[PDB]
Design a protein around this ligand. Structure first.
Ligand code: PLP
Ligand code: PLP
Ligand code: PLP
Ligand code: PLP
Lengths: 398, 398, 398, 398
């Protein structure tokens, strides 16, 4: 049915939402508001801007029109009411959590977390008297059992950093609705093109827009999407007062540029990673593979229900442990050795020998990290070139 | 008589410090390192990059060569050991204090702060079990009388926002050294061209680079300068984990561009501001007037000790109260009605009918804010046009 | 057939060719050389760079590393020896022809041309002693018969901008071997992803990089690719001395950003256009459709033979004439009315009522422009939304 | 004095002219229209737009709102009717001359020209039938005798890129008026802040905005200022059709940023320059010195008549010829060895061993280039550091 109130499709909105060129001298690309302050015609229009009474701007840290279009567009893409743009992923996560939690509050966390998130919680906010508990968010019994009435927030990534462990977002939402908690999901890996946690009951979605959304590895940015009520608070307290993590209008404009090919890029990320994952499963050097699009995936059924495509990230374990991981990493000639993900260029990392090298093997097992675990951000290059590079590096891995 | 590569002068260093073109293909202006991530030649090289050895970049949130140049240069200008660059002034202050303070520690503050510093403190970090206390930082006895063994940090501005109130920085530092407290000075209004708190005994300096250091009103940014020990902590804890206020390499490059004219612009700001404050002082409509370069200024002796020039900001209180504020502000044709300062274009605000418009006269009294107070950021325009515009707007304020 | 002598795939080279992060501090994305000028370690290493005896820059109007990477990359994608980046499409075209022609030389031109190319030739260089001859370049017998000993250059677009008329590039190149002319093809419409004239025997290719190569409509740029000797000549005469059409490094970086999704965007442009064009052919009001992908296209077999895909451009003819054209255009809610093409946003133009409405109905006819001629640049939106917009607007056409 | 048609001073206009923040949501700094194309609300609005009725925009190569701001501001600064922004100084020169010259026309030229301008004239437009004669533009008898009916343009720099030879601009205009000829002056060295050739009777002014206007060595740009009717033709023929030398809106915004400190930088460039000149003029290693601000300067009087300050450029000749100049350049440690000028960083060049190194001693003396001629672009650094560096390089010049 063609409809009068039917949403334009994802691609259309990623390109167009929230912008009419007619409102801006006909400019097809929005002009970039690289400006710190705005001006007032009088002080009555000025006082009304500080009140949230008129929808005109005063200062770029609080709100900016280039930033607003990005936020509006991202909110559309996630299906949410409102968006906030910030200087990084961590800036999104810290501004949100700082806003929502106070001493005595408890936050329930996914069992594994992105390292700096884990750092923010245990060495940052968790040292200012906020309580932390990890649970397996795929274990709805154990989550139910962990809830107190001090439980203010449930925060997780899905899929999660190390082995791609999923959580059942709607089943988690159900339990949060019962006890009255706020569910915050890091949707970095899937993006709104593949997973929309707000449509599954989550209250807030955070993103490292540094990754897939930008797509080209040339900005650092974060996004928060949720209801107006919550995002308004994160804007006026978390951002304004508590992190100062303001995104550049230059970078916001690059971000929107990237978002315009998001669907296209993700289709290719996913098509390439599928092929690569299936390659890796059949290789003698490989003990174990975690990829949502392989049938062997433990949470395969949950992956097809809550994500429309299995994603661009692969984690696998080399048989020969840390030495094998090192040699594999040092052999790659197309894949680059780097932290980060979601660029056009394929990336790889081996926490045992990189990010987490100055731990012991036993302390790595504590954080879900195998000695042979290698993570791949499969990029947009030709798959035959990527297979040739991976095959050659597997040989060198012995 | 000191010569042979002596310490180069302030202008020279503002243009050249930390950069020889021969190390980047002869490029006179350093290339902008607008990249999120960096690559390693081996995994072992990368083990060293997170561990602190063979340092040379993994991820722009922690560090980036464009930012490193800015940081080093601002360190040279302030005479500190190390710099840090962030997404905003608030980014600098929050990252600093989040790092230095924990529940049970106390911090002492100047009587009046920048609005959001004040809001961070009372409604942010204060609500996380950190004790706050306001002293007059010109009164060395009163400061001594507030010290406790839990006092970890002394934070203030000088001059400070409303009335241009100075602190005896050398005096505060002596006390702080006895007590093991860290002194953090917000040096935004002066910049290192006019005042260098580290040479007077402060430990850390912070800036809204949004203002004078950028000078052109097109970026939001902050800086921190101080000891390697303190800055390494602020970088690796406050910024990496607690704020995520990452500065865009693009804007960091505009900031370096602004710094290149800093002496020249500050000379002009100060020359324009002098003429205007002498003018305003001879005016029937103008009650009191707060400019450090008037002989009448209460702390004239302290200000000439700490500041090489009297600044670019004027505060004056008007006889007609709020009504005369509104008429004066709405009458300006050259000065712009906006918050912010240190821009090429002259700015004017009047908190009674704008920033603090719905606070009613009493809560305003408890912050230093007179009902007729008008703040001027004097800009770079021709002094005669600026005179004419103030002239004309006093007439209409009756 | 493994082995390192294999050419990497087009998408790999669009992302990586000519750049190794290791040579620039690990920066995954190359730093932007936003610098006018370059420096020398000695006056002797200076004397080498002006002569071309040493690899090194001196001045970004002649040469700059950000541009040089863009150039090397475009050369690889077209399969030429060398490239040159310029401030616009017309910068590439004029820099080329100013370099190659002198009074007395003849240039054979394709029968229709881009309006501004046409204007340059007849009202510009043509008025300076260079003779012009139009010829049907799809008619090899006629082209042979037009050659004369004064013929220096054969220049054309394929497909050609208005009606998608095409020329046999291998056929033209072979006539040009025989007589001695230099063949230059404007390959804007296809990009190197779809058509590679150098590989079919052309000497030089030019682009409006403003269109598809950029893909996102935020920049104005041009590219020449050809033999080292011809491009060097165009660099050092046409660009340096005769146009000054220097590309901003910033923009060159955006163009490299756009090229990273070129194959992905072209695939989607083309799929969307195939679907739209089939629809347009089945519809009452359409007199005559022209799309290379439909069998009714007069040079169907030639298109199939020189282009890997039929492209993103459609021209059709409404039955109601000039009036039905204005009516359809004004009815568009998603397609935007504007000149240009190869954006993510779909564009529509109607010369009789827009670009060529200054003219009379019979002067439009001299240039091959029907009265109901509508041109569509099909973008990357969801095809269903674009179908609906064009369905909706065909109704409004009676 | 005060009259209602009052003109704001140079610095005010450089910062404000042609922009009201109220016309763009209050944005203190103008938004950057980084867009290639522009949209129409109806087909008819666009029709009356290409035609020139209605003040809207269609394509950024023709015209762009950011560029038009820069163009109005530069027009104001030079006291001319209309402005044009281009990709480089050469862009402006060529776009100008290709508009006004045709085969058989004569252009009369100052005796010496910037090498690239000379190259354009002799090896470019001059090889298309345009006649060239060089004449001394200070000798008015010689110029009157040089005039012919073919003489359509008189083009020169003043001061001129040799030896700072000046032209009698008002004298020249009086002779050109007698014969209908168009006088175009390259005012790069002075900028409008120091010389306003249009006020002395010139028709058109050209600028490499790459130099002092930008001030910071980070862009390549050109400006033309003159009468509405000439500029229009240069835009709609030279720019649009004959060079395609389109300025990036981003670089245009950086150039506006630079112009905001033009007075202030030029004041310092000249004060540093006056100091090095008075020093250099007393050194035994130094034969001759060409600086307008020395009393011994042959054209002292004319210089002071056209120019409010003597400029930031110095040329001198070392007694020891080619080897002296080589040893001097090589010894420099603050001054950079580079071509270009008008940067905040001080630059120096020695044509005999650099630009014109490949040439012979007799061919250099033919263009007025001594074997020992050194040219300094005096920068904004501390004059004491600059003195020490020139000093030390003078001692090594033995
Ligand atoms: C990178 C990342 C972050 C951190 O974001 P930044 O933009 O790097 O600060 C958070 N979560 C996930 C899942 C990430 O990958
Ligand atoms: C503006 C300002 C700040 C805040 O910095 P932002 O860059 O606006 O975050 C802090 N201190 C002073 C004195 C300021 O003026
Ligand atoms: C647009 C176009 C040009 C001109 O390029 P600009 O970037 O607009 O200067 C040349 N040829 C074709 C086929 C074009 O479409
Ligand atoms: C540099 C220069 C030019 C040329 O300008 P570009 O921006 O380099 O093209 C023209 N005239 C003078 C006097 C110059 O110095």
């Amino acid at each position: 049915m063609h409809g009068s109130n039917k949403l334009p499709g994802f691609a259309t909105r990623a390109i167009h939402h929230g912008y009419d060129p007619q409102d801006h001298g006909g400019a097809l690309v929005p002009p970039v508001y690289q400006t710190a302050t705005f001006t007032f015609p009088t002080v009555e229009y000025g006082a009304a801007c500080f009140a949230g009474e008129q929808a005109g701007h005063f200062y770029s840290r609080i709100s900016n029109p280039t930033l607003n279009l990005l936020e509006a567009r991202m909110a559309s893409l996630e299906g949410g009411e409102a968006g906030l743009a910030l200087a990084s992923g961590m800036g999104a996560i810290t501004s949100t959590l700082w806003t929502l939690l106070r001493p005595g509050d408890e936050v329930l966390l996914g069992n594994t977390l992105y390292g700096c998130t884990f750092a923010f919680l245990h060495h940052g906010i968790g040292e200012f008297g906020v309580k932390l508990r990890h649970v397996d968010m795929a274990d709805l019994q154990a989550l139910e059992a962990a809830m107190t009435p001090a439980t203010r927030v449930i925060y997780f990534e899905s899929p999660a950093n190390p082995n791609m462990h999923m959580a059942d977002i709607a089943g988690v939402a159900k339990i949060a609705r019962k006890h009255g908690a706020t569910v915050v999901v890091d949707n970095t890996y899937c993006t709104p093109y593949l997973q929309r946690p707000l449509e599954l009951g989550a209250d807030l979605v955070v993103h490292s827009a540094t990754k897939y959304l930008s797509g080209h590895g040339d900005i650092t940015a974060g996004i928060v999407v949720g209801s107006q009520a919550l995002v308004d608070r994160i804007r006026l307290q978390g951002l304004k007062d508590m992190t100062g993590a303001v995104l550049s209008p230059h970078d916001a404009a690059l971000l929107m540029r990237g978002i315009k090919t998001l669907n296209l890029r993700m289709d290719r990320h996913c098509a390439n990673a599928q092929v690569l994952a299936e390659f890796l499963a059949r290789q003698p050097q490989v003990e174990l593979i975690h990829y949502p699009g392989l049938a062997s995936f433990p949470q395969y059924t949950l992956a097809r229900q809550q994500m429309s495509q299995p994603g661009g990230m692969i984690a696998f374990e080399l048989k020969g442990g840390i030495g094998a991981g090192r040699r594999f990493m040092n052999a790659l000639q197309l894949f680059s050795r780097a932290v980060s993900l979601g660029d056009a260029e394929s990336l790889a990392q081996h926490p045992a020998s990189m990010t987490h090298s100055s731990y012991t093997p036993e302390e790595r097992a504590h954080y879900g990290i195998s000695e042979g675990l290698v993570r791949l951000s499969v990029g947009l290059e030709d798959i035959d070139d990527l297979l040739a590079d991976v095959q050659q590096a597997l040989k060198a891995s012995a």
